[PDB]
Symmetry: D2
Subunit: 303 residues, 4 copies
């Protein structure tokens, strides 16, 4: 088996980023070559491991086999601006215009999320990593493109018809009046296949493990439940739910007691909705979840 994919998702700020770091560590404990890929422009991972990372995979300190890759459209952008600037030298006018268009792209809202997309696909076709752990929160909408290939197929057929009708007209035009679709079709197909390979790898349990992270709070439970549902529609298996920031059993003050009782209610809720799934529990730490120490500790708690 070439490469295995784990990915963590769930509501905002529940430990997606924390669990993926801890899983990275644990899987690195067994000798395995693991990369964690992060779309946080927040660059959460920096704050966790207490180390700088880049758009090119970096070894986490202490580990030869743990890497983190943080997608930064802007950096790779500027690198490319400097590079293209050399090519354009024959033509400053075209060159400055292309520079401008580039920048304009870079600043437009969609484009940051689609840098992420391109990276995602590059790592879905990749080898050289035993395990790739996607930190970036998938959802029904984030993965909505897996439905793309079918539409792409329809559209491609319409294009094919169109190409045939044009080719008849154009030839006559050239003959009578002196003096494209292949390219468009090629691109469409290339992408269609990339996405199809991806959808097959994610929809296959052997290769990819999707994991949901929740808090004992109605909100996280409900979001992550809906998520489970959309994903269930794509074919993506969810092997596990991880409850996190559980208040531990030894609590005394009226406060902790109260919040813990509420948490137990929500744990009945979780056990109800996701109960058909493996559920792991993680407690709320006295310390913040920060060091590689507390990380190894968390990983141990998960296993």
């Amino acid at each position: 088996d070439g490469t295995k994919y784990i990915m963590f998702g769930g509501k905002g700020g529940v430990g997606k980023t924390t669990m993926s770091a801890a899983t990275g560590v644990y899987l690195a404990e067994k000798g395995l070559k693991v990369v964690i890929v992060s779309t946080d422009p927040a660059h959460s991972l920096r704050d966790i491991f207490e180390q700088e990372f880049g758009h090119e995979p970096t070894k986490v300190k202490g580990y030869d086999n743990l890497y983190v890759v943080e997608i930064d459209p802007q950096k790779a952008m500027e690198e490319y601006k400097e590079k293209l600037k050399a090519q354009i030298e024959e033509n400053p006018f075209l060159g400055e215009m292309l520079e401008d268009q580039l920048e304009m792209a870079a600043l437009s809202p969609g484009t940051d999320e689609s840098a992420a997309f391109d990276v995602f696909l590059k790592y879905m076709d990749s080898n050289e990593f035993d395990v790739v752990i996607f930190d970036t929160a998938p959802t029904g909408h984030t993965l909505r493109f897996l439905g793309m290939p079918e539409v792409m197929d329809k559209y491609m057929t319409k294009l094919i018809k169109l190409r045939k009708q044009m080719s008849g007209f154009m030839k006559m035009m050239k003959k009578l009046l002196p003096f494209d679709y292949d390219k468009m079709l090629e691109e469409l197909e290339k992408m269609k296949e990339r996405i199809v390979r991806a959808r097959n790898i994610l929809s296959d349990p052997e290769r990819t493990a999707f994991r949901l992270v929740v808090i004992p709070e109605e909100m996280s439970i409900l979001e992550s439940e809906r998520a489970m549902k959309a994903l269930q529609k794509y074919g993506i298996p969810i092997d596990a739910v991880i409850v996190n920031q559980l208040i531990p059993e030894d609590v005394q003050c009226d406060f902790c007691r109260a919040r813990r009782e509420l948490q137990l209610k929500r744990l009945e809720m979780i056990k109800e909705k996701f109960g058909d799934k493996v559920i792991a529990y993680v407690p709320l730490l006295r310390t913040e979840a920060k060091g590689i120490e507390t990380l190894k500790q968390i990983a141990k708690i998960l296993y």
Copy 2:
């Protein structure tokens, strides 16, 4: 004064969505007509107010003046597919092709974030709402487009030169051989102005209040600090920081005591970094922050 804009941002899951709902309620308490606009595909607000919302503003129950708008590119999409399907009737072939292209857009990653962008601009040019509260997390990168206008200006000038050189050539082509830019420039300018109006309204304190939400945890404090900085570079004023999920003073078990001590450290950190700003504090509730009751309560606590 026509319309006022409040917007909350800060790390993932710190209470952006919660504070904006509570501010919505409080501002509605004083008779005021307030809309909360949400880019969460999570649809958090549904879970908070315990009510369904749509891409068209909906009254929160019990309130004539409180509305929630949830941007859903997909819904407005399908509405439009059904609509366009009627226009295309003369030409199924072109019609089906346009349908396809549409769907392909919809599924592409960027496009979801730019639906949000379009709505944002529509509400920036809008009246009819006394207060518009943006729930969607702005950051340096989410607002990076406010720098667009200037690049747009450069590019527009290059386009103007180009138009003049083409018109000389084209005229000659037409006479010598039988047998665009105005449109492009018009669009560019239209958008440039929209964004400039927006940048002026957000950079103006009288009109827009930007608010940061943090947890006493090194991570949220650091993110929201960087955010503060990027925003400070656009000219966007940050009038207030709201610390949230503060463990209250009455705590007994060793656990709460420990976490509270840590929080107090981080409160010295917040007081340090944002201290030049107004800081409001909110406690961690025994109950989940859910009902309109606990919402009015939170609002009261904020004021």
Copy 3:
């Protein structure tokens, strides 16, 4: 009445060019401001008047009011290459490319005949000349474009439908994702009108006199007859036929006698086919038809 148009056509080498020059002279005899416009790249007129002419109207020597304009796509071309070269200076790369495309146009076969077309239309919309005499041989096919307006009309309507269907689609494209026909329709209409004004002026006897030149030879008679027919289909009136190079009555040698007899047969043919039209006869000169002397003489013979 603003401007009057005479035009001569008929087989190759029958005196189109000769009769137009003589008509130019005669009409200039009565004080009248007359321009002869010539598409011969042969530049026949130079050889007739024994003088150089250019793409800008030139006074024939001895006459303030007689001008000749010889359309030379190539000259006006080079003039324009030199001019455009100054505009492109900011961008040599775009500039040299445009230069190349221009030259490529210039050398392509159609383009020489359409330079003629453009001039023709410029003089059809013109004032400042009492009489414009087109030397260039019209025929059914040379004037076939007068039927253009109607097709242009159909096509325009299809374009209008198309524009409406696009505007519905493009409009959503922009909102969903960031970030022509008016121009095409404007051009189409501009030309359609130009051609319609033209067809109305030529189809009008008061304004334009179409004249056919023949030799007493089966060939010229047949060509010019077919010409008469196509033209009759456009609504173009043919006011006169001019038989030319008639062998005079005083002839002696068996040779002249023979050819003259043949000519008289063909004159019965002409009188038969065109008889419903005014027919003028011109004899075959002992001298070549060259000088302004023989020209005034010919004109006198015509009137």
Copy 4:
């Protein structure tokens, strides 16, 4: 040797069409398979051979090996309109539009001359004919496109540069933003080669004989001299000049004597200017040059 090309040019109405028909006959006399190709929309050849011809080669009556092809853009057009109308059936809207655009082409002035061009090229790449005789008057300007290949080369190189700079940018946009020249270059090259093969065949004496036809009149002599010069600049050899419509030596009336004296002057002129070339003389017939009889007679006179 595959195919040989003869082509006759000279002033309007000097016997281009007559000499080419006579050469056709003579070459067919020796068993040889000869086609005459005519761009006259006049359809002169019909009048000569007294027979109908079409855009597909037709045997001249009495001859298996003598064909005439008359290029008629309009006929081949209508044939094609009827054909395309069947293909478009799935889409009337696109179909009618294409029909319209076609007609518009057909009526446009250039397009008739370029139909001729296309045919010319088809017969330059052709076999199946021992001898192809081009009736259509070449000149410096009619053949001016033979200079096209070099400009085509320059432009192609600019295109190549452009293609490389686009491919860098395009790849980057696809990757950053979800989600032609090959075709243009292919066409350019295809045509460039076609024209180069042509220019090599015409510039080669072994394969192609260019022949100039004149009248003993200053005009024809001057035109055909300039023609000789432009052609000499393309590398096209002119093997022969044919003086035509020479008044014979037996003449009596003062008239014939006069015109003949003038002709002898112009014959000194021809002998002067073209004297370095083979010159054949043809007399002015008592009969019109019409029947296949007088044609065989003329051919005998040429040989």
